[PDB]
């Protein structure tokens, strides 16, 4: 086996990123952070649900992948692969060391871990509001892969935007929003007037 | 092994300010130092000559000597259980007049006026400064200012 995760649970050390000083570090177990219908437009999926850390701790790259796979699989079976967009919101940048007497004890790189705070979002899922119960379950299943306490929170915001659901709607009823692939661009009342009128024709027209 | 060269640990201390690199402005060179003047030491990293050791960064002392490019400053350095007098030879680019003294002299002047004014007017004046005092009594009306009741708010998530 690998060393048990209890050995690397808490944030005891300063961040030890991969760097010019710390060259020969192994690859992360988690490579994919975006799953489901990642191409989906902002208007497609209003409901956002979050898995949120309630603990100052470290999560291994192996737990993030295992939790990803669990949550994805469940959501695709019960609702289908295009019913949600799942984003993993933590990247394991902190390298864990392992020694392997106490003369010359500075360790070698062992694996990677993500340092999470209290209140920090670990996973996010956007869906249609029909699909709340499914997403909440898939995130519930993921929780068993991580150490510590996580909470499952229904967001007041529209999808992955930073706008409360009514706010976003008013800005879309006006011409103040335009699609930019998966995300969105907002009209500012600032900058050149000419270039704004190129980018946001439906505003002004009113 | 360990390393304790003359500029060890100065990486940030002798950096120029952001967007303030390059030539020293001329006012630095037109300031006039006189023996007894109180100066603050702050190394300009662009002028490698005449440079104070990092210990003196942020220390204030008295000019004791004036030469072509430079001033001698006296600083009191704590060594062990006592202060030794140190004498530094600094180029003027690393020095500036302490405004502490500039604003004390304005008070000596102002006190002199007040004291003269007091004798001729023929009364008696307080020249010591006082610490900030307890507030005196005061009536606060509610005319167009009726008190507005606040309550603690419930917990919300965001």
């Amino acid at each position: 086996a690998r060393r048990p995760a209890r050995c690397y649970r808490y944030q005891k050390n300063k961040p030890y990123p991969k760097s010019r000083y710390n060259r020969a570090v192994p690859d992360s177990k988690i490579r994919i952070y975006d799953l489901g219908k990642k191409k989906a437009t902002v208007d497609e999926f209003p409901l956002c649900v979050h898995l949120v850390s309630n603990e100052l701790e470290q999560l291994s790259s192996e737990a993030l992948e295992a939790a990803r796979i669990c949550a994805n699989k469940y959501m695709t079976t019960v609702s289908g692969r295009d019913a949600f967009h799942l984003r993993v919101r933590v990247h394991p940048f902190h390298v864990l060391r392992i020694n392997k007497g106490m003369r010359g004890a500075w360790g070698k790189p062992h694996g990677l871990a993500a340092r999470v705070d209290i209140g920090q979002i670990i996973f996010s899922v956007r869906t249609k509001d029909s699909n709340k119960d499914v997403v909440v379950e898939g995130l519930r299943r993921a929780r068993y892969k991580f150490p510590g306490q996580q909470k499952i929170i229904l967001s007041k915001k529209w999808g992955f935007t930073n706008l409360d659901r009514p706010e976003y709607l008013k800005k879309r009823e006006a011409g103040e929003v335009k699609d930019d692939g998966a995300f969105v661009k907002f009209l500012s009342k600032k900058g050149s007037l000419e270039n704004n009128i190129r980018e946001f024709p439906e505003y002004f027209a009113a | 092994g360990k390393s304790h060269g003359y500029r060890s640990r100065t990486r940030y201390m002798f950096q120029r300010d952001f967007r303030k690199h390059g030539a020293v402005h001329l006012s630095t060179y037109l300031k006039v130092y006189k023996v007894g003047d109180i100066v603050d030491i702050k190394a300009n990293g662009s002028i490698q000559k005449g440079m104070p050791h990092k210990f003196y960064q942020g220390k204030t002392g008295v000019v004791y000597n004036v030469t072509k490019s430079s001033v001698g400053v006296i600083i009191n350095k704590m060594v062990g259980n006592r202060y030794l007098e140190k004498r530094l030879n600094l180029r003027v680019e690393h020095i500036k007049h302490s405004k502490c003294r500039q604003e004390f002299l304005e008070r000596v002047k102002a006190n002199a006026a007040k004291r003269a004014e007091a004798k001729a007017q023929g009364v008696a004046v307080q020249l010591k400064r006082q610490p900030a005092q307890p507030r005196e009594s005061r009536i606060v009306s509610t005319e167009g200012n009726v008190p507005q009741t606040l309550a603690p708010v419930p917990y919300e998530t965001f």
Binding site: - | Y64, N76, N81, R82
Partner: protein, 54 residues
């Protein structure tokens, strides 16, 4: 065998027993390190002031 390497534990307490004495100031400090050209003249100036209050 191995021992302790360094500490400043207890050193400020030792320093404050006989206090940290400020260095003591005089009217008339040493003209020591003062520019020699200035000093050489200043002798000549002080000479004349004596031969004048006489």
């Amino acid at each position: 065998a191995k021992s302790k390497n360094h500490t400043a534990h207890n050193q400020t307490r030792k320093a404050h027993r006989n206090g940290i004495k400020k260095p003591k100031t005089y009217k008339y400090p040493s003209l020591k390190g003062v520019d020699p050209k200035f000093r050489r003249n200043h002798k000549h100036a002080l000479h004349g002031t004596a031969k004048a209050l006489a």
